[PDB]
Amino acid sequence: DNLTDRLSRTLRNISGRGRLTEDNVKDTLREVRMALLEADVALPVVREFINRVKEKAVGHEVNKSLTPGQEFVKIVRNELVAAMGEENQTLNLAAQPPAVVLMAGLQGAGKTTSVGKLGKFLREKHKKKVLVVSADVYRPAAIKQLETLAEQVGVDFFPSDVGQKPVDIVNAALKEAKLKFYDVLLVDTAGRLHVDEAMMDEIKQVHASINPVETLFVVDAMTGQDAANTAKAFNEALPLTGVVLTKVDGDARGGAALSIRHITGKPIKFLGVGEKTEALEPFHPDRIASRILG
Ligand SMILES: Nc1nc2c(ncn2[C@@H]2O[C@H](COP(=O)(O)OP(=O)(O)O)[C@@H](OP(=O)(O)OP(=O)(O)O)[C@H]2O)c(=O)[nH]1
Ligand SMILES: [Mg+2]
């Protein structure tokens, strides 16, 4: 990423210094603010991050250590993690089976792909008997896409077709999920390229009839700051439990990851890091912060 190089260079010079002047701390923070802003991180997030470092990096606290540069570096890390999220947020599949995970996103965010990815993760790493279904009757080849995905990853597919109504489709799928003791039902959805009441009304009807335990917004990382604004929109119309940030491999900037948790107020739970089925990665903020700073 270009954020990783910029921050790592700015921090590296400070680490060696055995004492940091207040001007030295202020100058380094201005360079950090520019790097995050250049990475499409939202100003509300950058502003709060810089203020939190400044308060904790007062020279008295930083200069007390024998490695003041090191102490400053590791404040920046701690506050980056705080912005990206709280520890690891997982899906609650511990409630009454079947566990319904309803997935939303605008078209091309990668929700259908992510449906597959998640089903492989739940069966392989959690030994969950999984069933998936598609309420995207607007594109026919889409339903097939899920079907093909479901066999590559080894979950079960509940069939649907163009003529039928999304509410009827998920009601059938839950009924069936109960009858064969499935652990989770993942429910794919249609996307409209914009968060419009047309899209929200359909999701909220599905959502209402099927009481999902997790509502996951799939958002595309290479839309940068829009990802947070798009998810803040869906969240305002129908509350989210988690976000899946897809196409992280190609962004090369970041910012959606730093921005989503604080703009939306809900966590990034998963992270799409490849076109392949294996490329789903639970979101651990500590690991991401470490990579950004080296
Ligand atoms: N690099 C990368 N790509 C991802 C990731 N997740 C999804 N994609 C890509 O997103 C594209 C759209 O996926 P869909 O699953 O159809 O998205 P949708 O359900 O929201 O409509 C796919 O591209 P496609 O159909 O192969 O081509 P195109 O649609 O991009 O033209 C897929 O390969 C990811 O984590 N990393
Ligand atoms: Mg689709």
Residue numbers in the entry: 3 to 296
How do the authors describe this structure?
The stringent response enables bacteria to respond to nutrient limitation and other stress conditions through production of the nucleotide-based second messengers ppGpp and pppGpp, collectively known as (p)ppGpp. Here, we report that (p)ppGpp inhibits the signal recognition particle (SRP)-dependent protein targeting pathway, which is essential for membrane protein biogenesis and protein secretion. More specifically, (p)ppGpp binds to the SRP GTPases Ffh and FtsY, and inhibits the formation of the SRP receptor-targeting complex, which is central for the coordinated binding of the translating ribosome to the SecYEG translocon. Briefly, SRP recognizes hydrophobic signal sequences in the context of translating ribosomes, and SRP bound to ribosome-nascent chain complexes (RNCs) in turn interacts in a GTP-dependent manner with its receptor FtsY, also a GTPase, which localizes at the cytoplasmic membrane periphery of bacteria via a membrane-targeting sequence.
Determination of the dissociation constants (KD) of (Ec)Ffh-NG revealed an affinity of 7.9 ± 1.9 µM for ppGpp-binding while its counterpart GDP exhibited an affinity of 2.2 ± 0.6 µM. For the NG domain of the SRP-receptor (Ec)FtsY a KD of 21.7 ± 5.4 µM for ppGpp and 9.8 ± 1.1 µM for GDP were obtained. These KD values show that ppGpp exhibits similar binding affinities as its GDP counterpart for the SRP-GTPases Ffh and FtsY. We determined the crystal structures of the pppGpp-bound NG domains of (Ec)Ffh and (Ec)FtsY at resolutions of 2.5 and 2.4 Å, respectively, as well as the crystal structures of (Bs)Ffh and (Ec)Ffh in complex with ppGpp and Mg2+ at resolutions of 2.5 and 2.8 Å, respectively. The ppGpp or pppGpp molecules are bound to the G domains of Ffh and FtsY and occupy the canonical guanosine nucleotide-binding site. In detail, the guanine moiety of (p)ppGpp is recognized by the well-described aspartate of the G4 element responsible for the discrimination of guanosine nucleotides by P-loop type GTPases. The α-, β-, and γ-phosphates of (p)ppGpp are coordinated by the G1-element (P-loop), and by residues originating from the switch I and II regions including the G2 and G3 elements, respectively. The δ- and ε-phosphate, which are covalently bound to the 3′-OH group of the ribose moiety and discriminate (p)ppGpp from its GDP/GTP counterparts, point away from the active sites of both GTPases. Both phosphates are not coordinated or form any obvious contacts to the GTPases of Ffh and FtsY. The missing coordination leads to a high flexibility of the δ- and ε-phosphate, as observed in the crystals of (Ec)Ffh with pppGpp. We conclude that ppGpp and pppGpp interact with the SRP-GTPases Ffh and FtsY in the same way as its counterparts GDP and GTP, respectively, also providing the structural explanation for their comparable KD values (see above).
